[PDB]
Write a protein that binds this ligand. Structure first.
Ligand SMILES: CN(C)C(=O)CN[C@@H](C(=O)N1CC[C@H]1C(=O)NCc1ccc(C(=N)N)cc1)C1CCCCC1
Ligand SMILES: *[C@@H]1O[C@H](CO)[C@@H](O)[C@H](O)[C@H]1NC(C)=O
Ligand code: NA
Ligand code: NA
Lengths: 27, 10, 249
């Protein structure tokens, strides 16, 4: 479905200020 | 310190 | 949340506030999993040591919130509970093993820019993401310090910690239904969930499909943000068969 896709972020291809920190930890 | 919520919510 | 930051608008649209009708106060965090189901920690609803035993009519769920105290007219939606479901093997006597509960809403909530459900992980999501060092995100309107209260939703990103390090930090017996997260004293960086953050989500963004998954539920700790101590979280995937059974009915 559309779970876990945020209307103000993923749905607009906008990143929040710290999500890259999570991505960088997934080594 | 919580703002009152509309009556409709009980 | 101790040593976190203010959330951005729409950053955690699955964030739910469990709100006590009388006295009017913050009961716990929670999360939106569908238009009719809300996930929380069992200790938010049942905790005999503190004479906590809430029923459906005792509380309200407030969805789409950012401000802790204000009534967010045209943004937040307030829902009533139809029924509460606490895990039948929830262990409130010792270590909060299986600290999980579901709440069915009386009516479906409408999704918006501020209201949207989080995903629940499958076996593969959990195996790929629940690794020591991998960071998750915890949100809530709980205490800013162990010993005030925030004006808006708080956020903190924290690494999952190795099971032996979790075990060695406490005298409490740890089970497979929980995991611990937080920085070590040598890491420099800080942060933790605290009182009032209970029931809130520990989320991770899958790098595979770019969706947010709720891996944990804020469950317990010993104080907040103490050196050598870690926050403990209910392991959502470990209890998904119970979740699925209750929702299937
Ligand atoms: C600060 N408090 C109230 C405690 O440490 C109580 N400490 C107890 C506790 O945390 N409990 C019983 C019900 C639940 C609770 O209060 N949760 C709130 C909470 C949430 C997050 C964290 C954290 N990540 N640091 C700490 C507390 C635990 C004490 C050791 C045995 C398990 C229960
Ligand atoms: C909690 O409250 C219910 C009434 O809603 C009661 O039947 C139950 O025995 C109470 N205590 C526990 C520990 O469940
Ligand atoms: Na130990
Ligand atoms: Na700590």
């Amino acid at each position: 479905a559309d779970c876990g896709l945020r209307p103000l972020f993923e749905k607009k291809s906008l990143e929040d200020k710290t999500e890259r920190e999570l991505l960088e930890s997934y080594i | 310190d919580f703002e009152e919520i509309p009556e409709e919510y009980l | 949340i101790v040593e976190g930051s203010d959330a951005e608008i729409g950053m955690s649209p699955w964030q739910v506030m469990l709100f006590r009708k009388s006295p009017q106060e913050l009961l716990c965090g929670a999360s939106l999993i569908s238009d009719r189901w809300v996930l929380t920690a069992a200790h938010c609803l049942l905790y005999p040591p503190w004479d906590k035993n809430f029923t459906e009519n005792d509380l309200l769920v407030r969805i789409g919130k950012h401000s802790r105290t204000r009534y967010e007219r045209n943004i937040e939606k307030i829902s009533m509970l139809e029924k509460i479901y606490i895990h039948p093997r929830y262990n409130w006597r010792e270590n909060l093993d299986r600290d999980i509960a579901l709440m069915k809403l009386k009516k479906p909530v409408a999704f918006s820019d501020y209201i949207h459900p989080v995903c629940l992980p499958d076996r593969e999501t959990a195996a790929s993401l629940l690794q020591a060092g991998y960071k998750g995100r915890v949100t809530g309107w709980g205490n800013l310090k162990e010993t005030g209260q925030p004006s808006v939703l708080q956020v903190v990103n924290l690494p999952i910690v190795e099971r032996p390090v979790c075990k060695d930090s406490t005298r409490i017996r740890i089970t497979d239904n929980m995991f611990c997260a937080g920085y070590k004293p040598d890491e420099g960086k800080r942060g933790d969930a605290c009182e009032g953050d209970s029931g809130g989500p520990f989320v991770m963004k899958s790098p595979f499909n770019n969706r947010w998954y709720q891996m944990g539920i804020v469950s317990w700790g010993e104080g907040c943000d103490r050196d050598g101590k870690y926050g403990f979280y209910t392991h959502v995937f470990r209890l998904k068969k119970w979740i699925q059974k209750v929702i299937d009915q």
